[PDB]
Amino acid sequence: HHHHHHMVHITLDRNTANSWLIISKDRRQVRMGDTHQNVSDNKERFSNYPMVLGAQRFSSGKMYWEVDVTQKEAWDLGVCRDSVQRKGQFSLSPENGFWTIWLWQDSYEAGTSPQTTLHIQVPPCQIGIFVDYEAGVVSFYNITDHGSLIYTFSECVFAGPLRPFFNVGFNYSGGNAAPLKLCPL
Ligand SMILES: CCOC(=O)CN1CCS(=O)(=O)CC1
Protein backbone atom coordinates (compact mmCIF):
# COMPACT_ATOMS: atom_id res chain seq x y z
CA HIS A 1 0.00 0.00 0.00
CA HIS A 2 0.97 3.72 -0.43
CA HIS A 3 -0.97 5.12 2.65
CA HIS A 4 2.20 5.86 4.76
CA HIS A 5 2.16 9.63 3.75
CA HIS A 6 -1.20 10.09 5.67
CA MET A 7 0.67 9.09 8.88
CA VAL A 8 -0.76 10.80 12.05
CA HIS A 9 0.82 10.95 15.56
CA ILE A 10 -1.65 9.16 17.87
CA THR A 11 -1.54 9.48 21.69
CA LEU A 12 -3.65 7.59 24.26
CA ASP A 13 -6.31 9.35 26.39
CA ARG A 14 -5.72 8.31 30.12
CA ASN A 15 -9.27 9.44 31.05
CA THR A 16 -10.94 6.80 28.76
CA ALA A 17 -8.78 3.90 30.00
CA ASN A 18 -10.04 0.95 32.03
CA SER A 19 -8.78 1.55 35.59
CA TRP A 20 -6.31 -1.44 35.37
CA LEU A 21 -4.40 -0.03 32.37
CA ILE A 22 -0.95 1.58 32.60
CA ILE A 23 -0.31 4.22 29.91
CA SER A 24 3.36 5.24 29.46
CA LYS A 25 4.51 8.84 30.21
CA ASP A 26 4.76 9.57 26.41
CA ARG A 27 1.13 8.31 25.97
CA ARG A 28 2.37 5.92 23.18
CA GLN A 29 2.21 2.52 25.05
CA VAL A 30 -0.43 0.75 27.12
CA ARG A 31 -0.40 -2.53 29.07
CA MET A 32 -2.57 -4.47 31.58
CA GLY A 33 -1.59 -3.80 35.21
CA ASP A 34 -1.75 -6.56 37.87
CA THR A 35 -4.31 -4.47 39.90
CA HIS A 36 -6.48 -1.26 39.95
CA GLN A 37 -4.12 1.65 39.01
CA ASN A 38 -5.37 4.05 41.77
CA VAL A 39 -7.38 6.46 39.52
CA SER A 40 -10.89 7.90 40.15
CA ASP A 41 -13.87 6.52 38.18
CA ASN A 42 -15.50 8.67 35.46
CA LYS A 43 -18.22 8.17 32.80
CA GLU A 44 -15.57 7.94 29.99
CA ARG A 45 -13.76 4.83 31.34
CA PHE A 46 -14.40 1.43 29.72
CA SER A 47 -15.59 -0.67 32.74
CA ASN A 48 -15.80 -4.30 31.53
CA TYR A 49 -12.80 -4.66 29.21
CA PRO A 50 -9.13 -3.48 29.04
CA MET A 51 -9.91 -0.75 26.44
CA VAL A 52 -8.66 2.83 25.84
CA LEU A 53 -9.18 5.49 23.12
CA GLY A 54 -6.74 7.71 21.29
CA ALA A 55 -6.99 11.44 22.14
CA GLN A 56 -7.32 12.44 18.46
CA ARG A 57 -10.83 12.87 16.90
CA PHE A 58 -11.23 12.54 13.08
CA SER A 59 -14.26 13.92 11.13
CA SER A 60 -12.63 14.27 7.62
CA GLY A 61 -9.56 13.22 5.60
CA LYS A 62 -7.28 10.26 5.33
CA MET A 63 -5.38 8.98 8.41
CA TYR A 64 -2.81 6.16 8.89
CA TRP A 65 -1.08 4.80 12.00
CA GLU A 66 0.75 1.58 13.09
CA VAL A 67 0.52 -0.51 16.28
CA ASP A 68 3.06 -3.06 17.62
CA VAL A 69 1.39 -6.30 18.90
CA THR A 70 4.60 -8.38 19.39
CA GLN A 71 4.13 -11.53 21.58
CA LYS A 72 0.48 -10.80 22.50
CA GLU A 73 -2.10 -13.64 22.56
CA ALA A 74 -5.19 -11.38 22.42
CA TRP A 75 -6.03 -7.77 21.40
CA ASP A 76 -8.59 -5.69 19.46
CA LEU A 77 -7.56 -2.68 17.22
CA GLY A 78 -9.29 -0.18 14.97
CA VAL A 79 -11.52 2.93 15.28
CA CYS A 80 -14.81 3.72 16.94
CA ARG A 81 -17.39 6.49 17.24
CA ASP A 82 -16.63 9.04 19.97
CA SER A 83 -20.10 8.17 21.47
CA VAL A 84 -19.66 4.34 21.87
CA GLN A 85 -21.01 2.77 25.08
CA ARG A 86 -18.36 2.66 27.88
CA LYS A 87 -20.18 0.71 30.67
CA GLY A 88 -21.35 -2.91 30.77
CA GLN A 89 -21.23 -5.69 28.16
CA PHE A 90 -21.28 -5.04 24.37
CA SER A 91 -20.04 -6.63 21.10
CA LEU A 92 -17.56 -4.94 18.75
CA SER A 93 -19.67 -4.36 15.58
CA PRO A 94 -20.36 -1.49 13.17
CA GLU A 95 -23.96 -1.42 14.54
CA ASN A 96 -22.43 -0.48 17.96
CA GLY A 97 -19.96 2.04 16.41
CA PHE A 98 -16.75 -0.08 16.10
CA TRP A 99 -14.58 -0.92 13.01
CA THR A 100 -12.07 -3.42 14.44
CA ILE A 101 -10.06 -6.64 13.97
CA TRP A 102 -8.76 -8.92 16.70
CA LEU A 103 -6.63 -11.84 17.71
CA TRP A 104 -8.21 -14.46 20.01
CA GLN A 105 -7.27 -18.12 20.61
CA ASP A 106 -4.80 -18.34 17.72
CA SER A 107 -7.29 -16.97 15.10
CA TYR A 108 -7.69 -13.46 13.59
CA GLU A 109 -11.24 -12.12 12.93
CA ALA A 110 -12.85 -8.88 11.70
CA GLY A 111 -15.46 -7.33 14.04
CA THR A 112 -18.46 -7.70 11.70
CA SER A 113 -21.77 -9.12 13.04
CA PRO A 114 -21.34 -12.00 12.94
CA GLN A 115 -17.50 -11.95 12.94
CA THR A 116 -15.51 -12.74 9.75
CA THR A 117 -12.52 -15.15 9.60
CA LEU A 118 -9.26 -13.49 8.42
CA HIS A 119 -6.65 -15.38 6.35
CA ILE A 120 -3.18 -14.47 7.73
CA GLN A 121 -0.18 -16.68 6.68
CA VAL A 122 2.44 -14.47 8.51
CA PRO A 123 1.37 -13.61 12.13
CA PRO A 124 1.73 -9.80 12.32
CA CYS A 125 4.09 -8.09 14.83
CA GLN A 126 2.80 -4.63 13.62
CA ILE A 127 -0.62 -3.64 12.15
CA GLY A 128 -1.25 -0.60 9.91
CA ILE A 129 -4.69 1.08 10.16
CA PHE A 130 -5.98 3.36 7.38
CA VAL A 131 -9.17 5.49 7.60
CA ASP A 132 -10.71 7.39 4.66
CA TYR A 133 -13.53 9.37 6.32
CA GLU A 134 -15.22 10.63 3.13
CA ALA A 135 -15.03 7.25 1.33
CA GLY A 136 -16.34 5.34 4.40
CA VAL A 137 -13.31 2.93 4.48
CA VAL A 138 -11.28 1.36 7.30
CA SER A 139 -8.42 -0.94 6.15
CA PHE A 140 -5.89 -3.07 8.06
CA TYR A 141 -2.40 -4.01 6.82
CA ASN A 142 0.17 -6.65 7.91
CA ILE A 143 3.42 -4.60 8.27
CA THR A 144 5.43 -7.86 8.99
CA ASP A 145 4.30 -9.26 5.55
CA HIS A 146 5.39 -6.27 3.35
CA GLY A 147 2.12 -4.38 4.05
CA SER A 148 -0.28 -7.07 2.75
CA LEU A 149 -4.01 -6.37 3.12
CA ILE A 150 -5.73 -8.02 6.11
CA TYR A 151 -9.29 -6.56 5.85
CA THR A 152 -11.30 -3.64 4.38
CA PHE A 153 -14.56 -2.37 5.91
CA SER A 154 -16.30 -0.45 3.12
CA GLU A 155 -19.62 1.49 2.97
CA CYS A 156 -18.94 2.45 6.62
CA VAL A 157 -21.60 4.65 8.26
CA PHE A 158 -19.38 6.44 10.86
CA ALA A 159 -22.26 8.73 11.99
CA GLY A 160 -19.89 10.84 14.19
CA PRO A 161 -16.28 11.77 14.97
CA LEU A 162 -13.92 8.74 15.06
CA ARG A 163 -11.32 7.86 17.70
CA PRO A 164 -8.49 5.33 17.52
CA PHE A 165 -9.56 2.25 19.56
CA PHE A 166 -7.38 -0.25 21.53
CA ASN A 167 -7.97 -3.37 23.66
CA VAL A 168 -4.81 -4.89 25.28
CA GLY A 169 -6.91 -8.00 26.17
CA PHE A 170 -7.19 -10.05 29.38
CA ASN A 171 -4.11 -11.80 30.87
CA TYR A 172 -5.75 -14.86 32.49
CA SER A 173 -3.03 -17.07 30.81
CA GLY A 174 0.03 -15.12 32.00
CA GLY A 175 1.04 -15.03 28.29
CA ASN A 176 -0.62 -11.69 27.29
CA ALA A 177 1.13 -9.06 29.52
CA ALA A 178 3.00 -7.39 26.58
CA PRO A 179 1.94 -3.81 25.68
CA LEU A 180 0.32 -2.29 22.60
CA LYS A 181 2.79 0.35 21.28
CA LEU A 182 2.17 3.17 18.78
CA CYS A 183 5.12 2.86 16.31
CA PRO A 184 7.11 5.92 15.24
CA LEU A 185 6.49 7.62 11.85
C1 LIG B 1 -10.46 -5.46 32.84
C2 LIG B 1 -11.55 -5.95 33.71
O3 LIG B 1 -10.97 -6.62 34.87
C4 LIG B 1 -11.11 -7.94 34.96
O5 LIG B 1 -11.87 -8.61 34.32
C6 LIG B 1 -10.19 -8.48 36.03
N7 LIG B 1 -8.98 -9.18 35.60
C8 LIG B 1 -9.25 -10.24 34.62
C9 LIG B 1 -8.08 -11.20 34.53
S10 LIG B 1 -6.62 -10.36 33.96
O11 LIG B 1 -6.82 -9.92 32.61
O12 LIG B 1 -5.46 -11.16 34.22
C13 LIG B 1 -6.60 -8.94 35.05
C14 LIG B 1 -7.97 -8.27 35.08
Residue 29's contacts (CB-CB under 8 Å, 6 or more residues apart) are 23, 179, 180, 181, 182
Tell me the CATH number at 80.
2.60.120.920
Question: Beta partners for 67?
Answer: 127, 182
Distance CA 16, CA 47 (A): 10
Buried b (16+ CB within 10 A) or exposed e, 53-91: bbebebeeebbbbbbbbeebbbbbbbbbbeebebeeeee
Evaluate: CB of 32 within 6 angstroms of ligand 1: yes
Beta strands in the chain (DSSP E): 21-23, 29-32, 51-53, 62-68, 75-81, 98-104, 107-110, 116-117, 126-132, 137-142, 148-153, 162-167, 180-182
**Are the beta carbons of 87 and 42 closer than 8 angstroms?**
no
Give yes or no for residue 20 CB within 6 A of ligand 1. Answer: yes
Number of domains in the chain: 1
Tell me the residue range of the domain where 94 lies: 4-182
The method of structure determination was X-ray
Q: Are 104 and 74 contacting, i.e. CB atoms less than 8 angstroms apart?
A: yes
**Ligand 1 atom closest to Cα of residue 34:** 13
Give the ligand 1 atom nearest the CA of 172. Answer: 12
Separation of alpha carbons 53 and 144, rounded Å: 24
Strands ordered across the beta sheet of 29-32:
21-23, 29-32, 180-182, 62-68, 126-132, 137-142, 148-153
